[PDB]
From Swiss-Prot, chains A, C:
Remarks, miscellaneous: In both X-ray crystal structures approximately the last 100 residues are not ordered.
Consequence of substituting R19 to A/D: Abolishes complex formation and thereby decreases drug resistance
Protein name, as recorded: Multidrug resistance protein MexA
Disruption of the gene: reported phenotype: Disruption of MexA, MexB and OprM significantly reduces active efflux of N-(3-oxododecanoyl) homoserine lactone/3-oxo-C12-HSL/PAI-1, but not N-butyryl homoserine lactone/C4-HSL/PAI-2.
Family of the protein in this entry: Belongs to the membrane fusion protein (MFP) (TC 8.A.1) family.
Job of this protein: The periplasmic linker component of the MexAB-OprM efflux system that confers multidrug resistance. Functions as the major efflux pump for n-hexane and p-xylene efflux. Has been shown in one study to be involved in the active efflux of the autoinducer N-(3-oxododecanoyl) homoserine lactone, thereby playing an indirect role in quorum-sensing; but has been shown in another study not to be involved in efflux of this autoinducer. Over-expression of the pump increases antibiotic and solvent efflux capacities. Implicated in the secretion of the siderophore pyoverdine.
Gene: mexA
Localization, UniProt: Cell inner membrane
Induction comment: By growth under severe iron limitation.
Assembly mode: Component of the MexAB-OprM multidrug efflux complex, composed of six MexA subunits forming a hexameric tube, binding to a MexB trimer, which interact with the trimeric OprM outer membrane channel protein. OprM is thought to not directly contact MexB; instead, MexA joins MexB and OprM by forming a funnel-like hexamer anchored to the inner membrane. MexA may initially form a hexameric ring complex with MexB prior to OprM, then OprM undergoes a conformational change as it contacts MexA, allowing the periplasmic gate to open.
Curated annotation (Swiss-Prot), chain B:
Encoding gene per record: mexA
Organism whose genome encodes this protein: Pseudomonas aeruginosa (strain ATCC 15692 / DSM 22644 / CIP 104116 / JCM 14847 / LMG 12228 / 1C / PRS 101 / PAO1)
Induction summary: By growth under severe iron limitation.
Entry protein name: Multidrug resistance protein MexA
Miscellaneous: In both X-ray crystal structures approximately the last 100 residues are not ordered.
Entry's family note: Belongs to the membrane fusion protein (MFP) (TC 8.A.1) family.
Length: 81, 40, 81
């Protein structure tokens, strides 16, 4: 069914997400405490180059793209767009 | 960062599917009496 | 049932493919620029241990099998058979 309203949803780019066990979606974001956390997202579709996260990342969150090449959950870092 | 990639190459394969099933009579009928009596 | 013979197609092993949303097929390959990308494949059948990709991966592409346990698209890597 097509509901007539600008449907808004978080479209997190795949350049910042991984699929362990060839399925489970896990991402790395930085909390308000400038520390990196580990939250599991529920992205299923694939639009363009981003992934439609149904439940895992709300509006505002900061997704770490360039910096996962060497990191770990529980450390602090700098935020450079 | 390193991974174990495999070179994809065109192969010649055949498409065949196996459908499991049981055999059954084409048509079935029962033989019954319609009068009372003794079988001669 | 004889479903005809395919001229020449790609048979990407399941050990390098995933099915998100329990359906959509997504794979991870490394381009000529030694960088990994995210292309959506259309593999339906299952031959042996590989999947017949109808549309998603052409002849030549490199499919990442041993290493997806921890990675992400948009990064470069080494090619070890």
């Amino acid at each position: 069914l097509q509901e007539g309203v600008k449907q808004k949803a978080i479209l997190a780019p795949q350049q910042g997400v991984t699929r362990d066990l060839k399925g489970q979606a896990t991402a790395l974001v930085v909390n308000a405490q400038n520390k990196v956390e580990l939250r599991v997202i529920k992205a299923d579709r694939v639009i363009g180059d981003k992934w439609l996260v149904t439940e895992g990342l709300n509006a505002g969150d900061k997704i770490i793209t360039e910096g996962l090449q060497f990191v770990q959950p529980g450390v602090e870092v700098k935020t450079v767009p | 960062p390193e991974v174990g990639i495999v070179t994809l190459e065109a192969q010649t394969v055949t498409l065949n599917t196996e459908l499991p099933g049981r055999t059954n009579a084409f048509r079935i009928a029962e033989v019954r009496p319609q009068v009372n009596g003794i079988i001669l």
